[PDB]
Amino acid sequence: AKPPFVSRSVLVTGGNRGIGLAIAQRLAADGHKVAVTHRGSGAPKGLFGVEVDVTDSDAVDRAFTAVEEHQGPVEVLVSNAGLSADAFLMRMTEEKFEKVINANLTGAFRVAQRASRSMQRNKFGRMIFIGSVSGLWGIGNQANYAASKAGVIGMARSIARELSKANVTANVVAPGYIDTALQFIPAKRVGTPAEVAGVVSFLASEDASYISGAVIPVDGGMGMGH
Amino acid sequence: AKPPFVSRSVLVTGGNRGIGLAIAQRLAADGHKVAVTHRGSGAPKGLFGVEVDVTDSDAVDRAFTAVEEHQGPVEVLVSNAGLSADAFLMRMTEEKFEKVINANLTGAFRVAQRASRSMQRNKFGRMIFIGSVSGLWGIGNQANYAASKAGVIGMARSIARELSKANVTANVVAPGYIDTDMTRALDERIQQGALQFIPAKRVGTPAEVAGVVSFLASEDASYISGAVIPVDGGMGMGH
Amino acid sequence: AKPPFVSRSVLVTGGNRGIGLAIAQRLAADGHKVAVTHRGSGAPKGLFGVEVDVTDSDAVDRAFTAVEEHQGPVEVLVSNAGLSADAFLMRMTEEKFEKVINANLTGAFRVAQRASRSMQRNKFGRMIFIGSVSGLWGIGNQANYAASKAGVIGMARSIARELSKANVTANVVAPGYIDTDMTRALDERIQQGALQFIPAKRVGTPAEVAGVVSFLASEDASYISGAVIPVDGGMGMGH
Amino acid sequence: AKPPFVSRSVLVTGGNRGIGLAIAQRLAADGHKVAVTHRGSGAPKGLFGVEVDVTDSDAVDRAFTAVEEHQGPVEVLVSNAGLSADAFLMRMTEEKFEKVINANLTGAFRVAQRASRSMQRNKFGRMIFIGSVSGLWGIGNQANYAASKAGVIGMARSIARELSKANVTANVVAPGYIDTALQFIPAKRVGTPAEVAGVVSFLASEDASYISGAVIPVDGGMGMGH
Ligand SMILES: [Cs+]
Ligand SMILES: [Cs+]
Ligand SMILES: [Cs+]
Ligand SMILES: [Cs+]
Ligand SMILES: [Cs+]
Ligand SMILES: [Cs+]
Ligand SMILES: [Cs+]
Ligand SMILES: [Cs+]
Known part of the structure; x- marks a missing residue:
């Protein structure tokens, strides 16, 4: 019994490539x-663009405002914005660790926090964080990246436990290797961006209303474990 | 780009209610x-029915043959056929345990194994098992049910590890408390009591489970294999 | 402060090799x-032996009675009794599936259920199930074994949710590749092949599994219930 | 077949209360x-104490040095040092989030990184991070805390995948409620500090050699889930 479509105001961070x-x-x-x-x-052509560095809480504030004026308060937030700085642990610097944490984890916090008020008050919100298989699988040489992506899971679940009662859910999509190593992947191929996008489409739809606190792996089976 | 829709041959076990x-x-x-x-x-009207008890391997075989003749070999299998025989561990019998295991877990095996050849051969398969939050969350008085539903996760993952290379995936949907006739038959003590453990603070609907299955049966689901997707309002979060 | 040691009545199923x-x-x-x-x-010498097939509920009952008479009712149960019947899903029979389920999963139930009364009554119980990395990691050609070992996790968690209030806990130890006679019987293709997936880059030993069981049977383990502890050199990490 | 005891040089961060x-x-x-x-x-009386704020990479450096002079290079590191600053997400500040991340997650990185060289070279290391049930269970009003404690899991698993081959393991102990709410706990009681300490004792022992990348819950069953 498919629920009717609703056109939501969407913000995708790092949505340009x-x-x-x-x-x-x-x-x-x-x-x-x-x-x-x-x-x-x-x-990209067609879509409304706003300049934000997600390490800047004030810039995140006036991006949301700019979006609210253009297309209504953000109802679906897709937190994609991130980066890596891989190194062996012994080789890894305080600077390299903190820069990835600040962009990937604290940056996710900044947009989620900014989104929360309007979603709570309108009794609708979908926060969809783009995580990574690395979070719970543990790829070598990314102590910073893996910490950031596991951290977003914890963050999302705290938010889910607080705000799900207000119809504000928080879920993580955990992509594996996406063509934008193969021995670790049951499907024996990398995924496509469209294969990630299709899962986010599902999470932003009226069909995902009772999913909250979930980590959905889009990795051809790579990340299976405990 | 949204992949073009493909009309798939679907079998849903326990799909009559x-x-x-x-x-x-x-x-x-x-x-x-x-x-x-x-x-x-x-x-019901608008659905081709085949009579089978999933504890009967021979009946499972014949059911798949009747489906293949009607609408083509099974491409999307939804294994939903389930039952419970709840009790305190101390109270639980070998009979109650084995009965739930045979229907829920071995029955899931029977239909998966019967489906596999054709799916492997045609290089397309979607096995979707309807599990339970109970599997990894631990509901009390459910040693048999929890064992069966955790068991299907193990089974689905072994299948995913083996057959994902052939475009045959295996995923689990793990519903929490969903409003059915049986959940809405017990008094308000256990129903209100359950809401305390659900961040959404409400029961889920059959349609909300159906919507996730629809996604997993669609072309958008191609790179998901070995996943457990909870549809539980957040109930089952943990490790 | 380290809790004083208590000599516990221990039953280890499949404890003879x-x-x-x-x-x-x-x-x-x-x-x-x-x-x-x-x-x-x-x-073997220095261990009281009781003959039982864990597919036989009546034999399980008699084994526990012979243990109770010898050394007091079972306080610490280690459920290790296991076997595998590996095959491609396509190849796997109902017989191979049910056989492994009955011994590994229902057999674990039989010994747990027989243990429970006495443990609940005396307000002390430690059930320790020897599982497998395979349960949640997915090893190919192991649909039955993986289902059984994931199933014991579900079972142990339902038991933990029910009986933890009575100081009766249920935990799982999930070994990875451990050097036994059977792992060291297959040629170096599968053995060296497995090392690629183990961060430790070596097989584990029986003693390294035994050391974890010792911890879980000790007084230091009192507030651990429903846990799966992997002893696998990191092999099974994931979600 | 119990392995002989070895007296290890141990550093417990936040080991004074x-x-x-x-x-x-x-x-x-x-x-x-x-x-x-x-x-x-x-x-405490008897034990060697060193002053460190784990947000200070240089102070972490000269603590390890001071310990190495006193009792030999750290062989077992127990990263306990942390803190909370709970709030509703909408109520939670950039400052509150970052202070908990910096102490609990980046602070864990600082000590792990500093520990890594000597552990790798001596082909022995045990990193034991004190996490929390909140990481993967998702306690409301701790988006910062939960992010930090889930993040340490990701961090530990990346380290485990890199360094386990050198006999350097990384594990997390995840305590539930510890007496230093009861409805969510199967054991129907809080745990004791000694109950956490006993698990760390196990992880620091010769019996834990083949455990790496593990999260061991010490929570009376509270955190069970996925
Ligand atoms: Cs339609
Ligand atoms: Cs549009
Ligand atoms: Cs369209
Ligand atoms: Cs139709
Ligand atoms: Cs002592
Ligand atoms: Cs003895
Ligand atoms: Cs001794
Ligand atoms: Cs001492």
Whole structure:
């Protein structure tokens, strides 16, 4: 019994390339009103773009405001914005660790916090964080990345336990290797950006209403374990 | 880009009532060719029914043959056929334990194994097992049910590790408390008591389970294998 | 402060060889009163043996009675009795599936259920199930074994949720590749092949499994219930 | 077949009170050489104390050095040092989030990184991080705490995948409610500091050699789930 479609105001952070762009274009094809953040490179044709560095809480504030004026308060937030700085643990610096934590984990916090008020008050919110298989699988040479992506799971679950009663859910999509090593992947191939985008499409839809606190692996089976 | 829809040959076990019927109706409205199993009562209008008890390996074989002849070999299998025989461990009998294991876990095996050849051969398969939050969350008085539903996760993961290379995936949907006839038959003590453990602070609907199955049966689900997707309002979060 | 040691009445199923024997010897050196089950070969010197097939509920009952008479009712149960019947899913029979389920999963139920009254009554119980990394990691060609070992996790968690209030806990030890006679019987293709997936880059020993069981049977383990402890050199990490 | 005891040089961060003190005193009773960090309050009688704020990478450096001079390079590191700053997500500040991340997660990184060289070269290391049930269970009003404690799991698993081959393991102990709410706990009681300390004792022993990347819950069953 399929629920009627609702055009949601969407913000995809880092929505101008790779996986974020694929998500942005898919959600736009689904019928949503899609805004993206970026910083310098520019937004894709058709979609509303706003400049944000997610390490800047004030810049995150006036991005949401700019989006609210353009297409209504963010109802679906897709936190994709991140980066890596891999190294052997012994080789890894305080600076390299903190820069990845600040962008990937604290940056996710900044957008989630900014999103929360309007979602709580309108009794609707979908926070969808793009994590990684690395979070709970443990890829070597990414103590910073893995900490950030596991941390977003913890963050999302705390939010889910607090805000699900207000119809504000928080879920993580955990992509494996995505073409934007093969021995570890049962499917014996990398995934496509469209394969990540299709899962986000599902999480942003009326069909995902009773899913909250979930980590959905999109990794051809790579991340299976405990 | 959204992948073009493909009408798939679908079998839903226990698809004649409750969650299974909600799943089967949704999959049929999606555009798939939907068959359901039942144990005599029949299948409802607009669904091809095949009679099978999933504890009977020979009956499972014949059911798949009747489906293949009607609508083509099974491409999407939804294994929903379930039952429970709850008791305190101290009280639980070998009979109660084995009965639930045979239907829920070995029955899931029977239908998966019967499906596999054709799915491997055609390089397309979606096995979707309806599990339970109980599997990894631990509900008391459910040693048999919890064992069966955790068992299907193990089974689905071994299958995913083996056959994902052939475009045959195996996933589990793990519903929490869903409003059915049986959940809404017990008094408000256990029902209100359960809401305390659900961050959503409400029961789920059969349609909300059906919506997730629809996703997993769609073209958008191709790179998900060995996943357990909880549909439980957050109830089952943990490790 | 380290809690004072208590000599516990211990039953280790499948405690006459391999990992089970390593466990039983360690528990006996720890200071416990250790009994082992076997299926005829006998128990080794310094261990009280009781003959039982864990597919036989009546034999399980009699084994526990013989243990109770010898050394007091079972306080610490180590359920190790296991077997595998590996095959491609396509190849796997109902017989191979049900056989492994009955011994590994229902057999674990039988011994747990027989243990429970006495443990609940005396307000002390430690059930320790020897599982497998395979349960949640997914090893190919192990649909039956993986289902059984994931199933014991579900079972142990339901038991933990029910009986933890009575100081009766239920935990799982999930070994990875451990050097036994059977792992060291296959050629170096599968053995070296497995090392690639183990961060430790070596096989584990029976003693390393026994050491974890010792911890879980000790007074230091009182607030651990429903846990799965992997002893696998990191092999099974994931979700 | 119990392996012979080895007296290890131990550093417990935040080892002067609550759970950290219980761990420190237990590891000392086990026969290890036990050092603790603190900051102002002082160390317990008998045990070597060093002043460190784990947000200070240079202070972490000269603590390890001071310990190495006193009792040999750290062979077992117990990262306990942390803190909370709970709030509703909407109520939670960038400052509150970052202070908990910096102390609990980045602080764990600082000590692990500093420990890594000597452990790798001596082909022995045991890193034991004190996490929390909150990491994967998702306690409301601790988006910062839960992010930090889930993040340490990811961090530990990345380290485990890199360094386990060198006999350097990384494991997390995840305590539930510890007396230093009851409806969520199967055991129907809180745990004791000694109950946490006993698990750390096990992880620091010769019996834990083949455990790496593990999260061991010490929570009376509270945290069960997925
Ligand atoms: Cs559009
Ligand atoms: Cs469209
Ligand atoms: Cs149709
Ligand atoms: Cs339709
Ligand atoms: Cs003894
Ligand atoms: Cs001894
Ligand atoms: Cs000492
Ligand atoms: Cs001592």
